[PDB]
């Protein structure tokens, strides 16, 4: 309803309800093909990175990694009601790679645990 | 590291699947190379999808193992073999296994479609 990036200046809570609008707009002479291939590669790297975490097929993915207060010590009210996604993304710079590594390790442990649980007769 | 577990046993190499992943995606020759890498990645992802294994790196299935494909026990398979030797041993049956996997998914969704129809 608000458009492609209309929620960019809205709060994180309000902006979380517009994920499909932005998701649809990520996919749609030599330099035009290079641009198309770059768009496809960025999309596939993001989908692969979600798949590594066990989040494939979902736009909102809950995980088993606890939030560290050293990354951000704001409460949920301040993060979700009084902050935008751009300011939040600035706040968590230098921490996203640690979060990504923890998500990868947690999903590897989740896959091993599910495989062992499914191995019980 | 990438392919570091290629010489390790399969029981140890199966814990590095995310290390082997991510290296599959990243003047006309460079563009053809990028398109070819994307095409192979998507063919593999579609092949997993038609098996009901989408979004997973370790996917358990409902196809029983046929002793004619390999008569080794799990201790010998997982502790005394690498993935390269295993891949060589059962290459002549790989497509047969793939067909059976596809068939299982063809049944599975229909059963789920019926179970959700109650």
């Amino acid at each position: 309803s608000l458009g492609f990036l209309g929620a960019a200046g809205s709060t994180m809570g309000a902006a979380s309800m517009t994920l499909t609008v932005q998701a649809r707009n990520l996919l749609s002479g030599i330099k035009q093909l290079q641009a198309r291939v770059l768009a496809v590669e960025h999309y596939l790297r993001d989908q692969q990175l979600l798949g590594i975490w066990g989040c494939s097929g979902k736009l909102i993915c809950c995980t088993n990694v606890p939030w560290n207060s050293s990354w951000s010590n704001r409460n949920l009210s301040e993060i979700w009601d009084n902050m935008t996604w751009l300011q939040w993304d600035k706040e968590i710079s230098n921490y996203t790679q640690i979060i990504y590594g923890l998500l990868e390790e947690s999903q590897n442990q989740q896959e091993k645990n599910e495989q062992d649980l499914l191995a019980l007769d | 590291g990438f392919l570091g577990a290629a010489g390790s046993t399969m029981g140890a190499a199966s814990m590095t699947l995310t290390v082997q992943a991510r290296n599959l995606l990243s003047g006309i020759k460079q563009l053809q190379a990028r398109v070819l890498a994307v095409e192979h990645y998507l063919r593999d992802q579609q092949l997993l999808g038609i098996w009901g294994c989408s979004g997973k790196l370790i996917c358990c299935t409902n196809v029983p193992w046929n002793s004619s494909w390999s008569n080794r026990n799990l201790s010998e398979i997982w502790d005394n073999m690498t993935w390269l030797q295993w891949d060589k041993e059962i290459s002549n049956y790989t497509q047969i296994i793939y067909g059976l996997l596809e068939e299982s998914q063809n049944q599975q969704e229909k059963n789920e479609q019926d179970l959700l129809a109650l």
Partner: antibody
Amino acid sequence: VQLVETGGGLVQPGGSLKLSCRASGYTFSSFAMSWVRQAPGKGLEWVSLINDRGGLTFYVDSVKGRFTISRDNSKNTLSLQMHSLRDGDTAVYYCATGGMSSALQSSKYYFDFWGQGALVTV
Amino acid sequence: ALTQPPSVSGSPGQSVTISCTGTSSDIGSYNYVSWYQQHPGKAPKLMIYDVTQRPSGVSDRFSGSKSGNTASLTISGLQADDEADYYCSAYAGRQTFYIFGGGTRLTVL
């Protein structure tokens, strides 16, 4: 193979006791572990099971709460923390190897190496 | 969970049979019924696992089998050192992992 159960002694009803088990003679991280309880005059009863990696824990319904089983693969140490102990929990506990295995190992639904045992009195 | 006799007996050199009777959802569902020997005052050790598969370190006797929902341990060549309690351990699925019966006292005459 040796399992030494450096556990506790006497507690009051409603108290808490931690048992531990030190393993030697085998690769600890390769085997699942369990605690099995023997009450005098009743016989063996299985209490808890933990996987080889420590991520999965299982209990009988009667102790599904109150008990926590923990595994430390760096010190080859198994432990069981029992809270709110009941008078019915008075028994000799045994540390045992096996009972779960994993998807990539052979089937091991048995306990092959048993420890000396420790007496928990409530 | 499963029923065992309170005791068995026999003369040295004779064969004896110890049985465990469970239900269809545990012994009749899974072929994982191990048998243990516990001397009084000592921890039990594994005498046989699965159904018929004897571990190493155990003599030729103590072979077992199953039929229906009943597991059976056959001890041929009974020795004076076998005077111990015997227990079954049956796998009962994912919700209840293991079930034990009471002890069977083996008396050597």
